[PDB]
Design a protein around this motif. Structure first.
Motif, mmCIF file in Angstrom:
data_model
loop_
_atom_site.group_PDB
_atom_site.id
_atom_site.type_symbol
_atom_site.label_atom_id
_atom_site.label_comp_id
_atom_site.label_asym_id
_atom_site.label_seq_id
_atom_site.Cartn_x
_atom_site.Cartn_y
_atom_site.Cartn_z
ATOM 1 N N UNK A 9 0.805 -1.206 0.000
ATOM 2 C CA UNK A 9 0.000 0.000 0.000
ATOM 3 C C UNK A 9 0.839 1.257 0.000
ATOM 4 N N UNK A 10 2.145 1.087 0.154
ATOM 5 C CA UNK A 10 3.042 2.226 0.233
ATOM 6 C C UNK A 10 3.344 2.780 -1.156
ATOM 7 N N UNK A 11 3.422 1.897 -2.145
ATOM 8 C CA UNK A 11 3.587 2.334 -3.523
ATOM 9 C C UNK A 11 2.299 3.002 -4.004
ATOM 10 N N UNK A 12 1.156 2.436 -3.624
ATOM 11 C CA UNK A 12 -0.128 2.977 -4.054
ATOM 12 C C UNK A 12 -0.429 4.336 -3.419
ATOM 13 N N UNK A 13 0.143 4.592 -2.246
ATOM 14 C CA UNK A 13 0.018 5.902 -1.607
ATOM 15 C C UNK A 13 0.686 6.983 -2.449
ATOM 16 N N UNK A 14 1.856 6.650 -2.990
ATOM 17 C CA UNK A 14 2.585 7.528 -3.898
ATOM 18 C C UNK A 14 1.844 7.722 -5.214
ATOM 19 N N UNK A 15 1.488 6.598 -5.827
ATOM 20 C CA UNK A 15 0.698 6.563 -7.051
ATOM 21 C C UNK A 15 -0.549 7.446 -6.933
#
Ligand SMILES: Cc1ccc(O)c(Cn2c(NC3CCN(CCN)CC3)nc3c(C)cccc32)n1
Lengths: 419, 419, 419
Positions: free
Chosen positions: C88-94
């Motif tokens: 979910x950390x990549x998706x937070x950036x995305x």
């Protein structure tokens, strides 16, 4: 998995849980590019003069580390190159690489080499030139780039680039070279490390063929226990400056179990860590008795003579370890450990201390900020009386470098029986 | 041709038959690129914005080794750069490089420099832009690449690339620079070595001109005899460990006859061997009396004080020489020499021995595999009593580094007259 | 501005007038490239297979210096990478990088990072592909080049290239990162130096996003006085060779005033001079009392114990300083200083002397030609009796390395009270 012990008595720490991957040998392979002997249309006319000039240039072209020996890194690869200069030896390759790209050729001096034809420009130029442009400019570009690498590196390159050897070719090369299945998977899952330990040696242009040798690592030691030793200066902390004595364990570096002995790498930069796998090169190593590991638990042990250096120079510094930090705080220096969001959480006293990376993000020694590694693992603090307290400063040898616990003890005895 | 002697008594070997090529000085030349001040068609529109941005960035831009002195590698080249910042000095160049590309300009501070206009984009853009695309994208690409090299290297590059100076331009530059015909052929037959000893220094962008200085090597010493000295630890081989004493000749490196003296290069990595030609840089050298060579035949000679270090650290290792291998085997280490197709052919005893590359492909010391160089040449084994046997271990100085045969002899005498 | 003093009594010189720029910390930023999950027309067909293969590979991918501590250069950057591997950390950036390219994301472990979307290939390929070609081949080329850098460097690059971060993006990144206006202008006027002190760390490919961390220098110490100390061997010049004694100040390097103390950089190569600004890294430094500067004026002073080494090895050499040259001429060596157009203007006698760069272009010691720096500035010659004359050679310790004025004085006293 990864664990770490700190030894208060010797100002050192040991990181264990690592698996070896030692380059023990080399695999040499002959890579060939076939060339054309030539002497939307205009797009090829300028890309064809690029070609002629590349060929033009390609032809025009042809502490304890001091205890290490001295090798010749590409002696094996060059030894294969000298063979390809023999007459009929290039044509033997040219012959076998007729109906296929990947073939094992037996060279005339009892050397069986995996030979690879990675680019067929001869077949391209003679069939097409004498959509199409797209392929030319791309196959040609590779030639220009191989040429550029060789000309600014005098025919020897490392790490071996994707131009010298594509991921496709390298992976296939790895799979076809005859090693164990463990080695094959290890190399395949770490091709960039493989590339960095590889050499590309420009060999020859003769009879419409460009040949260079790729020197690839053989990992003959795999999955043995490895550990890293960190050491820092251990000094007394008397009030008056210049009255203090100091001692540092000089045997810091990587240690790997290997064939009944231990491989020691005094320059830890000649080793590359990937999670818990350590890639080292045995050229940069000494072979020690496994008893060397006894120096971590008992530095006064009678089986191995633990190596140290001595001084009177008590400067502060830190050593960032795998799972924490060794701090050598002396004199009037300010030394702290911090957490990212709360600040200073430990002020260090004079002497040599240690802090783990759990809860700690940075360490400060004087004006130097160190970030610690944030790898997960367990740290153990082994309390002990700092051994420097066991010596009388009046008969302590104050400038020893290539020394040991016994050598210092003898020097002291010579000074005591004296008085 | 190449020959090698091994000295059993001092655990050292000497490789002779080499010819010198020493960088003694620098030739500085000003390389210019003329720029346009602008402010199938679309192909140029995007290649023209590449141009504007390159200019944008180009403007935004502006053992015994410790005995060596310290130079400033590009002091001569930078000294020329400071002149081109003077007013009217760029326009003087711009003026002379009007009707031709290659011209010698006398700079205002008594410096005559070979100036070269290697790319005329001003003439191209102002005549064409304000087939054709092919030339633009290719001339422009060179500009982009020169720009890339300078930006990731802070305006100083080495080795000098084909972008900074094409093979064509370099060869012509070499031919026109005023040196002897020997130097010209030497440089021409070794342009990649030349490139590696060269510097490219970004100088200035002013009045529609991009200027950088190329600093090329002057080889003022050519074709004098050179020889390489290999040394390895010489230790006694007593049973009980820690009772042994060791001695290493510390004067290993390259040696070249030069102007009545000998140039010594303690870091043999600052020298590049091409068959039998050795390229060195005199910045990395000491000037010694030619008597230094007496240390190979007689290390006790009264004309030169041969330099050594001493220890009690008897670790095994090997030194791969030009035509063979020195092996220092001590303690319980396994040391062998092998042939490629028959395996182990010599097991070494404790002490320091030597094997030639004739019939031998690899040497093994402990867990370390060394390949030997397979160059053809004659090896000579000079039998002699190992000099370490001539010392009493009870009064032997066990940690000397910057020392010599006489310094050790005095230290011993002080310890003997004592008793 | 830049000035220099030479001290005849200690064979050393000090260059002052410099301003600091010390890397004290790191700024970490997450750089993202958005990718497409795909599975004159033909121009894109071949550029699209370039794309697929780049993603393919990107996935396959994932004297006194010994007194220094040991850091972990990219520990901070890697610490951020481990966070982006959390779910979910990549998706937070995305998510945050939806309607804009530049955004500050709060990462789940209390880390606020400047995130930058520098290339939107996902939006390009999904809107265009599923004039136009020009943009594809150029945006794609950047991807291929970032990929090449990472594969031959095992995911860690330095200096950070224009491909990893364009001049545009870097300048904007610098402007938006929250530091003082002094730092912002300093970094902006020296972006190539910034690039060289930066790291690019390949982090992750997950959920159609390529992410790497750029680790940029924080200069927490700016515009404090800096000075460089040059030292050279000081030897007696007696007739009979081997009867001489030598002494060298070992504390050479860069010195910068810093937070009440002095930062000392023993390896002057870890510092980069730009006119009168010195860029150093505090990782390569010791923190000393400011009293260390007392060693230049009075090496026998009672506040700081000036560090020296001793030998009997009187070889000649030169040290090129900021504004001149120290010459240590011993024995039979020929040592001169010259002007460019008039030749030899000073012949040096045995001992240690100095010449300024005013009127002098080169210095010669034996067979070694040094060019001097031609920077303008004032030199001062401070006459003094060479301190090596103050010692009796018969009780002089002849091989001290990690030593000092007091340590030698004690060793002598032990040898004198003796007799
Ligand atoms: C570049 C350089 C120059 C000269 C030199 O010697 C060395 C080797 N060396 C010595 N010297 C040893 C041991 C001390 N002495 C033993 C009798 N006091 C003399 C011989 N101490 C060292 C320390 C502390 C750290 C690193 C290297 C050291 N390196």
């Amino acid at each position: 998995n990864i664990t770490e012990e700190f030894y208060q008595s010797t100002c050192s720490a040991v990181s264990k849980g690592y698996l070896s991957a030692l380059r023990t040998g080399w695999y040499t392979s002959v890579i060939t590019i076939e060339l054309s002997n030539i002497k939307k249309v205009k797009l090829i006319k300028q890309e064809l003069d690029k070609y002629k000039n590349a060929v033009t240039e390609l032809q025009l072209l042809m502490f304890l580390g001091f205890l290490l020996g001295v090798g010749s890194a590409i002696a094996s690869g060059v030894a294969v190159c000298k063979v390809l200069h023999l007459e009929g030896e290039v044509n033997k390759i040219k012959s076998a690489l007729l109906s296929t790209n990947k073939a094992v050729v037996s060279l005339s001096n009892g050397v069986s080499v995996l030979t690879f034809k990675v680019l067929d420009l001869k077949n391209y130029i003679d069939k097409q030139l004498l959509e199409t442009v797209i392929e030319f400019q791309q196959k040609n570009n590779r030639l220009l780039e191989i040429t550029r690498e060789f000309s600014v590196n005098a025919g020897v390159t490392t790490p071996v680039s994707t131009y010298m050897l594509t991921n496709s070719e390298l992976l296939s090369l790895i799979n076809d070279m005859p090693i164990t299945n463990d080695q094959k998977k290890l190399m395949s899952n770490n091709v960039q490390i493989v590339r960095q330990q590889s050499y590309s040696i420009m060999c020859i242009i003769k009879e419409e063929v460009l040949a260079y040798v790729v020197q690839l690592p053989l990992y003959g030691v795999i999955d043995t226990p490895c550990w890293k030793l960190h050491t820092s200066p251990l000094c007394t902390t008397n009030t008056k400056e210049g009255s203090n004595i100091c001692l540092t364990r000089t045997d810091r570096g990587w240690y790997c179990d290997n064939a009944g002995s231990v491989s020691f790498f005094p320059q830890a930069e000649t080793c590359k860590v990937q999670s818990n796998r350590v890639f080292c090169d045995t050229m940069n190593s000494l072979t020690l008795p496994s008893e060397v590991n006894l120096c971590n638990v008992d530095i006064f042990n009678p089986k191995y003579d633990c190596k140290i250096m001595t001084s009177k120079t008590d400067v502060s510094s830190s050593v960032i370890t795998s799972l924490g930090a060794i701090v050598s705080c002396y004199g009037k220096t300010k030394c702290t450990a911090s957490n990212k969001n709360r600040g200073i959480i430990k002020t260090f006293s004079n002497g040599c201390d240690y802090v783990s990376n759990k809860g700690v993000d940075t360490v400060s020694v004087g004006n130097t900020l160190y970030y610690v590694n944030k790898q997960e693992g367990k740290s153990l603090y082994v309390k002990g009386e700092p051994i420097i307290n066991f010596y009388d400063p009046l008969v302590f040898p104050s400038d020893e470098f290539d020394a040991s616990i016994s050598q210092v003890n003898e020097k002291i005895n010579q000074s005591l029986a004296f008085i």
